[PDB]
Amino acid sequence: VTRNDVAPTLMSVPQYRPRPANPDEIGNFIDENLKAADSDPTAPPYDSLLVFDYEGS
Amino acid sequence: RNDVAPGNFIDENLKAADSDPTAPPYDSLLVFDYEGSESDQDQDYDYLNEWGNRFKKLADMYG
Amino acid sequence: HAVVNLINYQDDAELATRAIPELTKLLNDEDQVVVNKAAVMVHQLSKKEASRHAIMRSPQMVSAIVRTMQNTNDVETARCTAGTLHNLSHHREGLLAIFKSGGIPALVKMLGSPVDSVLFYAITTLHNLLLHQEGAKMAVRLAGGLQKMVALLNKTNVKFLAITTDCLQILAYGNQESKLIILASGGPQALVNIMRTYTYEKLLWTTSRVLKVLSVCSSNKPAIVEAGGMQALGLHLTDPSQRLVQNCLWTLRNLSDAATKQEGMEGLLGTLVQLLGSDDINVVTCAAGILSNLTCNNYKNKMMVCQVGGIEALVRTVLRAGDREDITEPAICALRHLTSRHQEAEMAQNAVRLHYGLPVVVKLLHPPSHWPLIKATVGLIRNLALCPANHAPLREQGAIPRLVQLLVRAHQDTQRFVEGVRMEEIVEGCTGALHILARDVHNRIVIRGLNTIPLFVQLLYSPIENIQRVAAGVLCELAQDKEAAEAIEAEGATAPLTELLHSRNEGVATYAAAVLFRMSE
Amino acid sequence: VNLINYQDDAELATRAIPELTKLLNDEDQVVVNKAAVMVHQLSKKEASRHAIMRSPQMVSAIVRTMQNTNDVETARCTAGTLHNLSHHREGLLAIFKSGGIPALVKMLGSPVDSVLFYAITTLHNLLLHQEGAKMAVRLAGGLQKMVALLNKTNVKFLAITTDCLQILAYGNQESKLIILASGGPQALVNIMRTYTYEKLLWTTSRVLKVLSVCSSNKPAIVEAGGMQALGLHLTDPSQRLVQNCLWTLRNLSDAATKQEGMEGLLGTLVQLLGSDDINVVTCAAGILSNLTCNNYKNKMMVCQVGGIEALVRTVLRAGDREDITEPAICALRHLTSRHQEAEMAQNAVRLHYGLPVVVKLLHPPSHWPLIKATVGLIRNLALCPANHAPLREQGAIPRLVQLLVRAHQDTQRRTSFVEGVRMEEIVEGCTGALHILARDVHNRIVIRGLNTIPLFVQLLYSPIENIQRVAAGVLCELAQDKEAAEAIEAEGATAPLTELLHSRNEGVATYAAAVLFRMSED
Known about the structure:
The complex is a heterotetramer, with 2 copies of chain A and 2 copies of chain C. By secondary structure, chain A is an alpha+beta fold.
């Protein structure tokens, strides 16, 4: 039939720092925070499950 | 099958409105109406001869 | 010999044909000692088949024998006359003769004789008549036999009782007045007594049948129960005689609806649960029905049935049953009763699931199932929902989709008693269930996810104080979520609901309140 | 003399049938017993057998005798009698019409082996040839008694029994359930791991196969150790045994993702991918697909037993056959993400010459389900920098953009599902593969040269967070270059990205703030 996406049972990885004041540093704030978004395992594509049901005759 | 019967004050006087024994659905009966759907080889009649005269004719036949 | 007999036959016969007239004339005499003697010879002749036929083939002879038997004051004579009839009683020719000669009323009268031999003869003859002579039932009935026969139920001869009770069965069958007479005569008690006193199979069986024929009566039913019928009949459920067992089962089932307050039902309740396992579907079907009724509004019985494993037995009953609604309905109702208003009701709700009841239960909601069964199934589903552990399962099986589907067809009709069930119940039924299912978040979603609110609120526009109560509870549960709480007032919620705050239903109120309340937050 | 003594003994039988009957009806238990023995011996002679088989009153009395009897001999006799009778169609119909099934079923509870054997065999014949026998056996409560018999040890008995179980279970839910409720899975599995009698093993697997389509037996069979037990036979010579296990294994597969100790199985499956039999390969590919879904230990193990190469070779050999390629490709996708061995697998696909065939599946005839899967796989393969160039040179970028455009136009013309797949997925999927692809400067150039920027920006206005994510994400990768950055700014991305900052999605906001920064970053 149709497939069903399955959420990745994480092993914990999220980690986004909050936007700091002193704009003289909001520039590197992104560099590291960005490396995080690229790492994020909770983003598609998700693994999928197809459900077979052949009973025969 | 005839049925047979037995500001947050809201969220606590509600816990009874849910657990009300005198509330539906009730049990019920179902009346059933199924109804479905001497041997004797004794030829001894001699006693007839020892009886009244009114039995003469009989005694004569059966001994 | 191969012929000597055949020669002596026609001979002894022709001789009898010659003797009858004389014996007739004698029986018609005024000197009762003559008649008394005559009666003796007649009885003797009646013992040899050749002599016998001559008598049967003689309306005057038989007529005389009858009169004499009923007017005589001599035991020895009554013994002979009645015995004679008894013997003729074994030939179709004789049964008719006895009948034409007015023997039935004379025989009934004999049922009053203190002499045991006369009673046996008499009852046996009537039995032969009741079984093979057209008119006997009505004649015996009209003659006051019923009262006479019930009156003999205090006798102890099992064989004699067996016959007497079978006579009652024959007369009581599908004849209300007869059954009413048997009652007015104290039959019920006398019968139950026999059931719990003797061990003769034929008598128990025979007796169980009169009870069966008596159990379909609105009047006798209550009596048999007060007599101790249920307990009594329960005693034989494990007898090796399958005919005794099936008959007790039928009777028990018929009486079942009236025994919902009887006690000492532990012996019975146990076996019945056991009987559900029988390889005989009819035994199961009966047990199922009996269980259904006995678990109706009697927390004590409910308790017992569970303690002995009724839940598994009933669930499996449903599974075996399949499409046979005559089996599923009582079985399902039994599960419904067993899953509420009693200590172990919590555990029951679990067991059903634990024995894979849910899948099939839900399935029974869909066709070919009928309304009487759906109404039952629905109620069972609702009770199964009181258990949180069943919320997910019931959803997965598709409970919600179909419930709502029913509520719709059901409602559209409470506008414009099908299959026996009145739709107003189906409405109160489905929504009632949905109400409890609504307790689970994911369900609420699925519930409103089918756009039900247009209906629910509109169900406040119902006079049926109960249909109301649940509609408020569905909302009271659905409004617990913001996105929905608003979609409720977006149809005209407060309007009716406000009023329903004054309703005389301690329920409808508390609900109607929390509904508006949350709705605006 | 053989056609002369038949009608003789037959007629001679019709001469004793009636009496024998009355004897079985006799009250003296001993009379009956002896009588049963006589009727039994009589059923051996084909002649007599037809006389009994035609005497409804005799049959009914035999059945009755069997169920009510207490003589282990009468039991065996009456049981046998019914059996010997069950070989002719009239015997079946006879035994049937006279309520023999329920009696037979009751007998399945006998401690007398001979009786059991007879009973189950009679019933079997009935199931196979008597119209109405199945439902009758279900009503009598046979399933429970039958599963209970799986406790036995006579292979030939078990054979029959399981086949009865199979016959009654096929397409019947209540039955499948009852089998389950009675611990069928555990019994069936045990057989599978204990006996070696082909016929039995095959039959038992056919039962399992039938149960495996049930939502309630599925988990049970898995939990009963079904996956592994079934695995034990993927090498057997009996192709029928093997194929049934494969089928059963595939139906169970979705419910076996959290199962431990699957090395062997996972191992055999990989091997089987090299079969000549399409059915075998297919099932294998299907099983591997599911088994590698969100189970990292499984993924790691497959990569370590030659899975990537095997899967690649299969996809290669399968050509247009999507029954093989979709699960295979999905497997490869699963194997290329979220696990310590992913990187290896990413290079593995390439080092085994899969990139070409993979990029190719992005083109017709390939259907949506397959394309979706392939896009996803290409995205993972793109995580490995050693795949950018090779992947680029296979013309994947131009094609992804094509699918992205068309699919997206579809999601737009539906404002004024296909083969299951919904274009919005293809949008997210393709934009996502371009986002991870946009890591190579050369690729950034190509993606940009296809005039994709304006479209990406548009996607920022998408309601679907994930699309928003990849759109902003690919935009971020491009914007790391001046011209690109300004071309983007000039497209009006500044406005939408700004608001995507107040997005509840961490990744989304980050990418947004990144572009807004990359743009203005002199």
